[PDB]
Amino acid sequence: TRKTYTLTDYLKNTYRLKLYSLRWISDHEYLYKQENNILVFNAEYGNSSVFLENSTFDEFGHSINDYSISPDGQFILLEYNYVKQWRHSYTASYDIYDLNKRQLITEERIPNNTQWVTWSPVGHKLAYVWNNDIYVKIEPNLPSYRITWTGKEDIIYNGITDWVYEEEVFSAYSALWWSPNGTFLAYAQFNDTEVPLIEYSFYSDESLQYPKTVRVPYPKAGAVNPTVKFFVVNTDSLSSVTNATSIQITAPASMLIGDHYLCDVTWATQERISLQWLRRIQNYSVMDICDYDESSGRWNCLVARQHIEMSTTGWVGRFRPSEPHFTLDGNSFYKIISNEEGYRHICYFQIDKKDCTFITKGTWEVIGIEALTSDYLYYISNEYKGMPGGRNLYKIQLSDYTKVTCLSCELNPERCQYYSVSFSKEAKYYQLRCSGPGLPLYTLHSSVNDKGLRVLEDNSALDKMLQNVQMPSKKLDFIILNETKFWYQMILPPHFDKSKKYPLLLDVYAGPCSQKADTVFRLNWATYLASTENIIVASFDGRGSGYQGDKIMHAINRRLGTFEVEDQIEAARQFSKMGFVDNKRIAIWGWSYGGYVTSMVLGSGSGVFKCGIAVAPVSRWEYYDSVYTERYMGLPTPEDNLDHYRNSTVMSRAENFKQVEYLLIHGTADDNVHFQQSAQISKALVDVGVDFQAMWYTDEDHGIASSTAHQHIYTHMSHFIKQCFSLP
Amino acid sequence: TRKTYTLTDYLKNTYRLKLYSLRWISDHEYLYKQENNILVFNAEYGNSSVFLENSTFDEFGHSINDYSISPDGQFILLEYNYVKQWRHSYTASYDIYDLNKRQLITEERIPNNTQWVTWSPVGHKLAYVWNNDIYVKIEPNLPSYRITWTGKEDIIYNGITDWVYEEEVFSAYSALWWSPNGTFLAYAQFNDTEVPLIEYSFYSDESLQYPKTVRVPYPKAGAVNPTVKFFVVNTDSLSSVTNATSIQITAPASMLIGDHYLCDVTWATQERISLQWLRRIQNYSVMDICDYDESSGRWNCLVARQHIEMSTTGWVGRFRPSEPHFTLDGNSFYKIISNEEGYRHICYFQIDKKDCTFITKGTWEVIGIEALTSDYLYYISNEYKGMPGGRNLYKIQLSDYTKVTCLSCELNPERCQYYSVSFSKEAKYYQLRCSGPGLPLYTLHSSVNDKGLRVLEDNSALDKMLQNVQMPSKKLDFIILNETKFWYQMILPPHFDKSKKYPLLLDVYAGPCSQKADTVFRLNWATYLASTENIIVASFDGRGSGYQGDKIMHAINRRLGTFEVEDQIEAARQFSKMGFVDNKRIAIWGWSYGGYVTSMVLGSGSGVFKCGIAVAPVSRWEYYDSVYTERYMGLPTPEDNLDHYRNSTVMSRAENFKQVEYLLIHGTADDNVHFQQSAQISKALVDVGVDFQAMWYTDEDHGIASSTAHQHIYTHMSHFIKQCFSLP
């Protein structure tokens, strides 16, 4: 009898997915780490050489965290002393190694505690941020030029984001943007002066006698937000003037009338930059297109080139307005926007014409634009077989929009229904990454003829291992509610028998634009629960979920904690109707937004669920950050949406928790969903006399991702679920 | 079949002990609140009158928290807007009502947020502290004289104690001492300038968007301590035109050489005050006896009148050096100190002679001196029947120390073995309070022939109620370890059958000078566990426990987390070999110091205990406060006791928790044992991969005493214990 996929298997990573992470350094070469060596590969022929021997930095005296080659291949940036901050941010030390001299650079070093560093896109200029100010080095061994003098910890951020811009706007710590040939450096400056601080204890190693109070500028919903300014400096003038001027580009009047955000920066050409601004009420966005004026040294944004993007039904964009993709001459661009039917499709704009032309259409959505050449645009969509949870690469002929080729659909249709892609520098080659429903498959292709060049990684090692294991299966299907298809997936135990009644765990996220029903192959906690414990683990994408049009996505507009919650309950009722579910053993669990929905469901009084687990839940929308929360909820004021803010809290349902077994879990150093959120849940449950289970994770953040804590939480949750399901 | 004593009975206070809380106002009369009416009783005959009608303040407008009648009976101080701070501190608003003209004083009122208020001991002067400064009112309707001007929140404390002096030294927020007739007001001033602050989150009501950070000056072991100065002011020579002059009494040179504490203030006469000072290394203390010099207006403390009290085996005093009890002329005094055999007995000192004479002796201890006349000294001791956990009132003839009379021993030997006493102003009468082993019994007596005048409260109502409940019994007995008797108690189930095996829960405190085995009647959680769940609840007093001499008490000097933990394991080992104990079902629990011991026991690898619960435990002595910790541990420096601080932590034992079930509980607003301590425990268990149960209590402190949290914790603990013992 074949073994099952056990909890220890999951927690110890005994069955490991192989990846193929390459880095394009040109239009036909990529770097690949093999056996701690860095190899350089020729894409056309697949032959390789050693770029950097594994033993090069033995006597470096530090463990190197990451590396970065300069665009001209002359230098490598060595990252060490990595100290993580938030989701994207971190600090590090940096050395520069001269590749042609085979020497480490010892003068005018990038300082310790550097917050961000980036090569120019061409050559080997560097911009870095240190103590919240910007510096540029023209040559790796020469002195830096200071660009800003206003940087102030927790107060003024030049070239880096504050907490909320990092998490909610840019998904990056960096807030600087080199022009395409590196002449100009554009950057944002954030002012957090009147932004309130979240404060929480950090206990650290047991040697620390007094706990530290961590203090982070964090605007909760309705609070004072950071303000923002945008500047461009000419780095080519740095060696010529004592103090090069940062030229400000001001937001349009339609933004300046109130609170607003900078939400996108995209260079079009050497002397043309595009900026998108978003009103604090996030249903109105404005793109400015600004040109360098050689005679005045200023940047001017013609109103004839200004583009409005607004929504009557919800917010703008999936999580933010989409990025433009400019044609080489910078006189036109492509952009994913919601069409008249509410489906996100590629629109083609002339920079000085307000009406765009949709180049794709249908009842499915474009996920992203991946590459653009003079002849073709390449994009990912979920068109294939009308499956919103699939992803495929398509190529559209720019001179004839009726010519649309699916590049990935039919490569291995049984094994591969979810693709991402990685193009070489000028799109001469592409790497396809299939992530399911079979084992991930990595392949290389040439764009000139769309022929497969070779398989890079096929996970045959893992396939061989998994043959000796009773693996679960995955069903992806839909149910029809109110004449609309809503998709679900089930992780089903090995030897699934429809004539039996299985315990069911509903795995929930259900945030706006979420998707939990897809074609991705995963080895996770659900795999163990199905394989070893014979539990069906289900997920459902109801109202508010993404990639299916605005009618579904915007259904929860101004109303979080309503339809997305109800639809999870309804999903569980539908799963019972299917006849293989033990109605006495239905559980629910989720993390983050999923913890909020789980808690809302458990407090609904539905009677459907025996037990559930919320990890790091939101409990009350006024506790969560402004940019995310207000996008869906508006402002917590009597004149806007306070009534629904107050009506959608977990705490107001405390009394209904008498009907369920609840486990509440939160990391004490969660900078994102503050421990406060679960602290208020537990207190409301104490106050009505509801018994529940609890677990805090000392110094863990929103990820609860340290090796020991990750193993501890999943072990704790497994005992809880098994107890609930009367499993030995 | 009758009911058992249930968890709800405990939680809802179904069976209430009656009290008789009286306030002596003279040598012949006391006050007693009955049906909200304050009555005055004649002690000799037991007749009464209404002193103040409950209706007097019908339209007062505020709920009155407490009252305080001026010593002369002319005024009543009304306390309201009570807001708790630490164990003893709070602020309140006050009004003064004139009892003769039957009116509230509206002129020159005591301010809101007053920190401490006290009548002079004679007449009706007031001293109060507001905004950390001292004020005096000679008459309730007259303007206050500001005594001090240096008061500053969290920094300078005049006439009130800081966190550590409140908790550890004075067991009070007051640091004011009126002279016997109210002429002088002595006070301490605390300076916390360089004392570090503990910081922790307070979440408050759900409406609070951002948590508050509470910051309290709190010296952890080895940290910078508050400094102290001492002053006396003449309240008879106060002026409206000139600021008051306070005369400083400086500490002896033997104290000034380093860190030290003021640990006792006791007036001897109208013009003689005594002060005891304690070195930071708390095995050396000095009493100064200081006299007012009428010609110089200074206070002089003759070196011939200094009394040194030191210890070679431990620290000085039980928790601090004892209070002296001065004779009428203040030329001599009586003081409990450890004798040459290490038993605490009453010594008689002349103010200017070095040697004292012990007036009591034997292998038992005096608990306290209660009253002193020219003929007799009245004290409580555990002499009777050699039972360390019993308490009786004795008097000793001062002219013939061989003449000692027990005044309570034989009153009711079966019902009453544990007494406290309240004497009238000149010891003409006394109230005895019997608190076990039977129901509390309150009686009044006259000193001249020790007549038992009357029964004040016999709890006969409770007796009648309890007749219809299956109540547990208590066994008090001893075991012998290494030729020494150590006492234990067992709360035994109703209808105890020594031929049956019962599960056993070891209820532990075990701190230095603790006593958990005694003759006190209690209705608590253990009552429910025994009566309803048929669990034996045992407690044991091993090495480090009090009231049995220093050989036992000082056994843990410089070595907390050693013998007191070992001895709990040994007691349980012995209990487990008794015929009526199920050795497969032995548990342990404790709170505070008992939580630390429970955790050390469970991490010991003993194999004796199946499960345990630690509530608000100490985990590492470096995290607890200097005054308590260093008393037992010295300083955490390589030169002193750092090695033992480092190997007496709970965290180092994490691995040993693998074979036990552990429940760890802590309030997040614990100002005393910081949440930190449990946060470090949970992190250590996570780090070695040990599963355990947890519960935090949002905004609860060391008491976890709010009505809802109190019910919640005992509910949660009861499920845990029952689960552990396989109890339905």
Ligand SMILES: *[C@@H]1O[C@H](CO)[C@@H](O[C@@H]2O[C@H](CO)[C@@H](O)[C@H](O)[C@H]2NC(C)=O)[C@H](O)[C@H]1NC(C)=O
């Ligand atoms: C992969 O092989 C190619 C083709 O042999 C290498 O390209 C050059 O080949 C010519 C042979 O005519 C030689 O002059 C050189 O040895 C090669 N020079 C270059 C441009 O590298 C190529 O080197 C190989 N690529 C890698 C990454 O190893």
Ligand SMILES: *[C@@H]1O[C@H](CO)[C@@H](O[C@@H]2O[C@H](CO)[C@@H](O)[C@H](O)[C@H]2NC(C)=O)[C@H](O)[C@H]1NC(C)=O
């Ligand atoms: C960041 O914003 C703050 C406003 O919150 C600016 O601070 C003000 O500066 C002016 C001087 O121009 C003063 O008169 C005010 O007292 C300041 N207000 C506050 C609340 O401090 C600050 O100058 C901005 N910093 C930058 C670099 O833009």
Ligand SMILES: *[C@@H]1O[C@H](CO)[C@@H](O[C@@H]2O[C@H](CO)[C@@H](O)[C@H](O)[C@H]2NC(C)=O)[C@H](O)[C@H]1NC(C)=O
């Ligand atoms: C480079 O120029 C900038 C911008 O003019 C200078 O920044 C100003 O510095 C002065 C005085 O220190 C302040 O009063 C202004 O408020 C600053 N403005 C900004 C945008 O920061 C900067 O100090 C200059 N550096 C040098 C070396 O001269």
Ligand SMILES: *[C@@H]1O[C@H](CO)[C@@H](O[C@@H]2O[C@H](CO)[C@@H](O)[C@H](O)[C@H]2NC(C)=O)[C@H](O)[C@H]1NC(C)=O
């Ligand atoms: C990168 O682009 C910039 C901006 O177009 C170039 O700088 C300009 O060069 C032209 C020469 O064709 C001059 O007329 C302008 O004076 C320059 N403008 C500025 C703002 O510097 C730059 O030459 C390009 N760099 C490279 C390496 O080609």
Ligand SMILES: *[C@@H]1O[C@H](CO)[C@@H](O[C@@H]2O[C@H](CO)[C@@H](O)[C@H](O)[C@H]2NC(C)=O)[C@H](O)[C@H]1NC(C)=O
């Ligand atoms: C204690 O607080 C109360 C309320 O703040 C004070 O009494 C007055 O209360 C009314 C409303 O209750 C306010 O209009 C006044 O400002 C208060 N003061 C006056 C002028 O009487 C009271 O004064 C405070 N007690 C003291 C002695 O300061």
Ligand SMILES: *[C@@H]1O[C@H](CO)[C@@H](O[C@@H]2O[C@H](CO)[C@@H](O)[C@H](O)[C@H]2NC(C)=O)[C@H](O)[C@H]1NC(C)=O
């Ligand atoms: C309380 O005691 C003080 C101090 O003994 C008394 O004050 C003294 O009274 C005498 C009168 O015989 C004066 O000659 C002294 O000058 C006073 N000394 C001081 C320090 O003021 C006070 O009178 C007593 N009060 C009561 C009410 O008995």
Ligand SMILES: *[C@@H]1O[C@H](CO)[C@@H](O[C@@H]2O[C@H](CO)[C@@H](O)[C@H](O)[C@H]2NC(C)=O)[C@H](O)[C@H]1NC(C)=O
């Ligand atoms: C008070 O306690 C201290 C600490 O136990 C004693 O001082 C000495 O402590 C150091 C290390 O802390 C040791 O080297 C000595 O053995 C201790 N002194 C001796 C016994 O010589 C101190 O002696 C104690 N004081 C009293 C009055 O006994």
Ligand SMILES: *[C@@H]1O[C@H](CO)[C@@H](O[C@H]2O[C@H](CO)[C@@H](O)[C@H](O)[C@H]2NC(C)=O)[C@H](O)[C@H]1NC(C)=O
């Ligand atoms: C208790 O009884 C005594 C004596 O019977 C009370 O009477 C004494 O005091 C009264 C004033 O309080 C006077 O009215 C009596 O004359 C006086 N009697 C004597 C001779 O002492 C006494 O007040 C009563 N006590 C209380 C508190 O009510």
Ligand SMILES: *[C@@H]1O[C@H](CO)[C@@H](O[C@H]2O[C@H](CO)[C@@H](O)[C@H](O)[C@H]2NC(C)=O)[C@H](O)[C@H]1NC(C)=O
């Ligand atoms: C309280 O104690 C502090 C010392 O902890 C006193 O301040 C002194 O120490 C300062 C450093 O914190 C020195 O810079 C000063 O010389 C010294 N005095 C002054 C002027 O502050 C402080 O005075 C004390 N306060 C009181 C009222 O006694």
Ligand SMILES: CS(=O)(=O)c1ccc2c(c1)nc1n2C[C@H](N)[C@@H](c2cc(F)c(F)cc2F)C1
């Ligand atoms: C698809 S995307 O544009 O890259 C994007 C950008 C930002 C995103 C996101 C997806 N999904 C989330 N976020 C940021 C947001 N703070 C995330 C989040 C939401 C919660 F409700 C929450 F409680 C925690 C949390 F981390 C989810």
Ligand SMILES: CS(=O)(=O)c1ccc2c(c1)nc1n2C[C@H](N)[C@@H](c2cc(F)c(F)cc2F)C1
């Ligand atoms: C008998 S006594 O002199 O009144 C006295 C005074 C102070 C006392 C005490 C007894 N018992 C304790 N304390 C203060 C001390 N902080 C108490 C305590 C000890 C701990 F180890 C602890 F972890 C918490 C805690 F509150 C116990």
Ligand SMILES: *[C@@H]1O[C@H](CO)[C@@H](O)[C@H](O)[C@H]1NC(C)=O
């Ligand atoms: C970084 O810090 C290390 C260790 O403190 C130091 O030796 C080194 O000089 C620093 N590097 C730079 C560039 O300052």
Ligand SMILES: *[C@@H]1O[C@H](CO)[C@@H](O)[C@H](O)[C@H]1NC(C)=O
């Ligand atoms: C943006 O949202 C607010 C609140 O719903 C609404 O009143 C306003 O009209 C919206 N703007 C657009 C462009 O629809």
Ligand SMILES: *[C@@H]1O[C@H](CO)[C@@H](O)[C@H](O)[C@H]1NC(C)=O
């Ligand atoms: C009393 O002392 C304070 C503070 O030192 C001072 O400000 C005040 O004016 C003084 N009053 C008199 C009457 O001297």
Ligand SMILES: *[C@H]1O[C@H](CO)[C@@H](O)[C@H](O)[C@H]1NC(C)=O
């Ligand atoms: C270098 O990498 C590792 C040691 O770090 C070693 O296993 C490998 O064989 C080396 N590379 C070569 C030359 O194969």
Ligand code: NA
């Ligand atoms: Na009597």
